Design a protein around this ligand. Structure first.
Ligand SMILES: Cc1cc(N)c2nc(N)sc2c1
Ligand SMILES: Cc1cc(N)c2nc(N)sc2c1
Lengths: 9, 224, 224, 9
């Protein structure tokens, strides 16, 4: 998930 | 005025240029490619913006994802609507990408852009302020009606905090109209309607397979 | 309390039975026929109800038509939602026509009925009262965002009168929650979303041509 | 229009 990656970064 | 409203003002992302490719002939495919590229970049800044909203980052990553998967197109559309308030029958997607009726017809977007211009008309007549815009964009995120929420109570609390900020803002700045906060809330159904239309329109462009789309835009279109 | 709220309570139409044909085998076609017949009859009583709303009958017949053409499916859905508040995972279309999940799957309505049950869940958690229901149904009519309005100012005035009645009702009856009126307004986007889904679903059943529909239901489906 | 007829009646 790019959405999950960006929310974590 | 209100600290939540002042916080959301400083959290507002910088302007993004569309940069339509000057080597490519004007076409429906070029206009749709340009707009999907612009949405993909704005989605990255929307994700970073959401983390400044009080309480959002304390939700589970599943709930943060759910709220953004339901609200992203409302947030994109409110941005276009706000940028367009000083214009007449034109949509300011970006400072370098202003669409009139002819351009909307050429891109196959006349019905969608006419619904976005309906939102503009009502906010112009209500003299929408930037303070109200940023607070309604945060409310739209919090009130996005995902079917997948884990912590229903925490998401209600986020709605209530942002609702209270709008109401406190209006109580202080707009004493002439004690119901202005509720008028602003009554603009949210048309935003929901126009967002659903937009998602369906671009999902159909996805299925037709003639417009390249970047990974994040695709992820959000696919979510529904 | 509030005179507009008490007026809308006495204006509320009587219950309508579905009367599914006991000679006809159970089928998707029978369930969809039964529901479209029930909507056609309720649309007649909705038109008569609207004339009791203060100011509605003073609009032009064109504006009265426009508001009802945009809001009719929201009004039908709010009725089903209100009737369902005492039930669990069941939709009370009528006292003789209560649909569970299996029945929704058999009628091809699982996705639509799950969105209607989302509306029920939120109104149950907010303990929606009949007073609030009837006032929100009138607001949904007034706030239906037709693109065809002649007298924009008169339609705004109708919205404001009904908004003021909700706010005055909540100020008197719900002092524990000074933002309850705005919470009720924040339920209207999901109603708009679920209505648009329903209209699209039944327009597609119309195009497929397997379910007979009466003239008034057809007139309202065709309007969009 | 049946809608117009009912609004007039
Ligand atoms: C409706 C709509 C579609 C887009 N592609 C878009 N991109 C933005 N940056 S706002 C927006 C709105
Ligand atoms: C969604 C929906 C569909 C119908 N046919 C209907 N009929 C009623 N009387 S309420 C309603 C709602």
């Amino acid at each position: 998930s790019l959405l999950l990656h960006l929310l974590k970064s | 005025y209100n600290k939540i409203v002042s916080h959301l003002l400083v959290a507002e992302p910088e302007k993004i240029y569309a940069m339509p490719d000057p080597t490519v002939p004007d076409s429906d495919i070029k206009a749709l490619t340009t707009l999907c590229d612009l949405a993909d970049r704005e989605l990255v800044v929307i994700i970073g913006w959401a983390k400044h909203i009080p309480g959002f980052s304390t939700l589970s990553l599943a709930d943060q994802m759910s709220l953004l998967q339901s609200a992203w197109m409302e947030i994109l559309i409110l941005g276009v609507v706000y940028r367009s308030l000083s214009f007449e029958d034109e949509l300011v997607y970006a400072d370098d990408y202003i669409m009139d009726e002819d351009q909307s017809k050429l891109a196959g977007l006349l019905d969608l852009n006419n619904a976005i211009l309906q939102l503009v008309k009502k906010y112009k007549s209500m003299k929408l302020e930037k303070e109200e815009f940023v607070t309604l964009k945060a409310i739209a995120l919090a009130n996005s009606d995902s079917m997948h929420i884990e912590d229903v109570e925490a998401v209600q609390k986020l709605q209530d905090v942002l609702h209270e900020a709008l109401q406190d803002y209006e109580a202080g700045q707009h004493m002439e109209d004690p119901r202005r906060a509720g008028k602003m809330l009554m603009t949210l159904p048309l935003l929901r309607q126009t967002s659903t239309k937009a998602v369906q329109h671009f999902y159909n462009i996805k299925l037709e397979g003639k417009v390249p789309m970047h990974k994040l835009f695709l992820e959000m279109l696919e979510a529904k």
